[PDB]
Amino acid sequence: LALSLTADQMVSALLDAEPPILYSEYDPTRPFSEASMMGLLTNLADRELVHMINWAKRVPGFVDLTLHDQVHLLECAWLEILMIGLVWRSMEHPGKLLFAPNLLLDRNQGKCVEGMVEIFDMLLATSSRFRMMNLQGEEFVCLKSIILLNSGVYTFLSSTLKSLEEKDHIHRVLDKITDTLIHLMAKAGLTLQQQHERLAQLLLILSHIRHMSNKGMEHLYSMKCKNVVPLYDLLLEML
Amino acid sequence: SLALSLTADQMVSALLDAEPPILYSEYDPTRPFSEASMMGLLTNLADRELVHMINWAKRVPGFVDLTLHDQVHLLECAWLEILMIGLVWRSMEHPGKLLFAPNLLLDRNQGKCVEGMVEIFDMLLATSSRFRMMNLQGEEFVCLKSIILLNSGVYTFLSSTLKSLEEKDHIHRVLDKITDTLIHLMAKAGLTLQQQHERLAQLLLILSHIRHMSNKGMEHLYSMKCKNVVPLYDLLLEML
Numbered sequence A: 001l002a003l004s005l006t007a008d009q010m011v012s013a014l015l016d017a018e019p020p021i022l023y024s025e026y027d028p029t030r031p032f033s034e035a036s037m038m039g040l041l042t043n044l045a046d047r048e049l050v051h052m053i054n055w056a057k058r059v060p061g062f063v064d065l066t067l068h069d070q071v072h073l074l075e076c077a078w079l080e081i082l083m084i085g086l087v088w089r090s091m092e093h094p095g096k097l098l099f100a101p102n103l104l105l106d107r108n109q110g111k112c113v114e115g116m117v118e119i120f121d122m123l124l125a126t127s128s129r130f131r132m133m134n135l136q137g138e139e140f141v142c143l144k145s146i147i148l149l150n151s152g153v154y155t156f157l158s159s160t161l162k163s164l165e166e167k168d169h170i171h172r173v174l175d176k177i178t179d180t181l182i183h184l185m186a187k188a189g190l191t192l193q194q195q196h197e198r199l200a201q202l203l204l205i206l207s208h209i210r211h212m213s214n215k216g217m218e219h220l221y222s223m224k225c226k227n228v229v230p231l232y233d234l235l236l237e238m239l
Numbered sequence B: 001s002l003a004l005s006l007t008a009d010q011m012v013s014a015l016l017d018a019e020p021p022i023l024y025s026e027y028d029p030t031r032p033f034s035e036a037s038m039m040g041l042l043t044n045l046a047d048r049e050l051v052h053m054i055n056w057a058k059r060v061p062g063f064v065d066l067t068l069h070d071q072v073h074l075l076e077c078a079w080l081e082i083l084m085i086g087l088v089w090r091s092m093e094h095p096g097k098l099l100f101a102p103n104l105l106l107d108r109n110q111g112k113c114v115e116g117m118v119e120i121f122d123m124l125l126a127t128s129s130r131f132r133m134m135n136l137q138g139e140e141f142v143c144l145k146s147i148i149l150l151n152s153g154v155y156t157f158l159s160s161t162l163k164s165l166e167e168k169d170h171i172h173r174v175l176d177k178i179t180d181t182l183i184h185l186m187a188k189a190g191l192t193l194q195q196q197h198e199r200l201a202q203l204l205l206i207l208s209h210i211r212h213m214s215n216k217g218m219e220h221l222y223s224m225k226c227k228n229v230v231p232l233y234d235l236l237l238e239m240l
């Protein structure tokens, strides 16, 4: 049915599906600590996550898919999706990251966590690029839905007939979203050359976002290894 | 500053001529395959392809216009994506397999012949497979390799100084020039404007999955250099 939507419909749909911007259960009453910040960013994420599931369902063609496939799409893309959102919100705040309205960290405040400055710089850089290209919200939502539908497809066990028809559907929506991007740029008045040139710059960024994502994934799990679970503690209680 | 002049057709020839030699795995068909045997087999091939990649990068429009440190930064963020896209291209004609080199053609399984490297194989196989069904053209292919070179490392540039931002503009102009080139190749091949934009998007989104395989590869590679390294056993068999 999404395959029916005209460009203008594809835009409103997406725009309305946009999730609420959440607040960090952040408390200035207390100081920031390596682990303090991690759980802070972590809770914000586990909560945005919940809203992400509501959003994914609102995206054209998404629910046309199989439960399994939906879970595989959201399980390969969740962190890219958070990152692009974080990036979008951080545009108006040069040099900083608006994780949430009440949580605005600048570069440095990143060092308040082991090896997470690198991921901050990249995120700052990305937000900076979006700014310099004057990314529009209409453009933004197209890209978020692309990331959903596209980062998990090469990693589908395409061994059976339902899996491949599953993939075609995915690529048709993707083309439909590309049609939309082009329309938005046509409308904005760019020539056809600028059009294809801008579709390319936007898409090539999704690459750097996949990158940050993998970096993030690495840095996140290494945290879950460290400060994972004591023992000297439960034991002392018991004795 | 030459690059930005090149017409589409000139951009393709430049790139096609820049193409590195196809190398042979300097190995023995006699000897079988062990976790450590393979790794070194693929690793040498790679270190050798690496040396050739340097000659290639230097012949890519606008790459030498850049700063030495910016050049090392680009090849360092992308060398493995670059090898990956070439391996994938070469494997097109060999459904289900990976033509690392003419004399080294591993199929899926032969991958398990290395700890946790089946995953990366499948992804490579899947990628080669996608290129096959989209009927990727060599002209299309070389545009994509040069895009990976120029684009995979520009965000991770310390854009804190003036020459650094002018450094980045130049890189984005060549990139636009390469996009122009891709669209020209597709127009010429007769696709409609819709199919044109549509195909430029499918091609570029794959670069994303390549970035992925790259990071996974990077992880798997370094984990090998931690574990599989000093003979130990070998040094003992010897001495003993």
Ligand SMILES: C[C@]12CC[C@@H]3c4ccc(O)cc4CC[C@H]3[C@@H]1CC[C@@H]2O
Binding pocket: A041, A042, A044, A045, A048, A082, A083, A085, A086, A099, A116, A119, A216, A217, A219, A220, A221, A223
């Ligand atoms: C995954 C991390 C914690 C959660 C962070 C987050 C949390 C919420 C959000 O909206 C965006 C991001 C982007 C960066 C993420 C971080 C990158 C490193 C860290 O481990």
Ligand SMILES: C[C@]12CC[C@@H]3c4ccc(O)cc4CC[C@H]3[C@@H]1CC[C@@H]2O
Binding pocket: B042, B043, B045, B046, B049, B083, B084, B086, B087, B100, B117, B120, B217, B218, B220, B221, B222, B224
């Ligand atoms: C980097 C690895 C070794 C070298 C391999 C290679 C070696 C040569 C080449 O032309 C392409 C590739 C792609 C996959 C690479 C592998 C992925 C995992 C492994 O560690």
Ligand SMILES: [Au+]
Binding pocket: A075, A076, A077, A151, A152, A155
């Ligand atoms: Au994934």
Ligand SMILES: [Au+]
Binding pocket: A032, A033, A034, A111, A112, A113
């Ligand atoms: Au701190």
Ligand SMILES: [Au+]
Binding pocket: A153, A154, A167, B130
């Ligand atoms: Au696909």
Ligand SMILES: [Au+]
Binding pocket: B076, B077, B078, B152, B153, B156
């Ligand atoms: Au990199």
Ligand SMILES: [Au+]
Binding pocket: B033, B034, B035, B110, B112, B113, B114
């Ligand atoms: Au084996």
Ligand SMILES: [Au+]
Binding pocket: A129, B154, B155, B168, B172
């Ligand atoms: Au850039």
